[PDB]
Nucleic acid binder design. Structure first.
Ligand SMILES: [Zn+2]
Ligand SMILES: [Zn+2]
Ligand SMILES: [Zn+2]
Ligand SMILES: [Zn+2]
Length: 109
DNA sequence: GCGAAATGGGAGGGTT
DNA sequence: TAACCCTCCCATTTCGC
């Protein structure tokens, strides 16, 4: 785990440093305040500085949930949302809250 | 209402 | 170069009861 960040931001007063030039060029859009990637869903009008941020956001509109829990078959749109959910099973036949297995799990969604 | 859990966004990291 | 996906932090919202 190295800390050498050779790419420094040239913005006046900014001390940001990054390991890769792509990370620095991605940071430079924060000073310009430009957010060109706008969500065109109804009654949203949200916008982001990065295209991947817009695609992550638009999954809440499209209902795309590629990540599925191997224990209770619950689906999530993000990998970190799935990993956090799996902690509910570590502490605690039906693995859904308040219910007494694949058919039952699939019917919950 | 309470705590837990889910949700959503920023920021940064890697892989092509 | 940058699209693309992952990982962590954080505040807010929703759920379970
Ligand atoms: Zn900067
Ligand atoms: Zn939207
Ligand atoms: Zn689960
Ligand atoms: Zn059940």
């Amino acid at each position: 785990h190295m800390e050498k960040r050779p790419f420094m931001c040239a913005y006046p007063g900014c001390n940001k440093r990054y390991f890769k030039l792509s990370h620095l060029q991605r940071h430079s859009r924060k000073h310009t305040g430009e957010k060109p990637y706008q969500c065109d869903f109804k009654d949203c009008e949200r916008r982001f500085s990065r295209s991947d941020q817009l695609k992550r956001h638009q999954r809440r509109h499209t209902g795309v949930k590629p990540f599925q829990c191997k224990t209770c078959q619950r689906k999530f749109s993000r990998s970190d949302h799935l990993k956090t959910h799996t902690r509910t099973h570590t502490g605690k036949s039906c693995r859904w809250p308040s219910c007494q297995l694949v058919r039952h799990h699939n019917m919950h969604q």
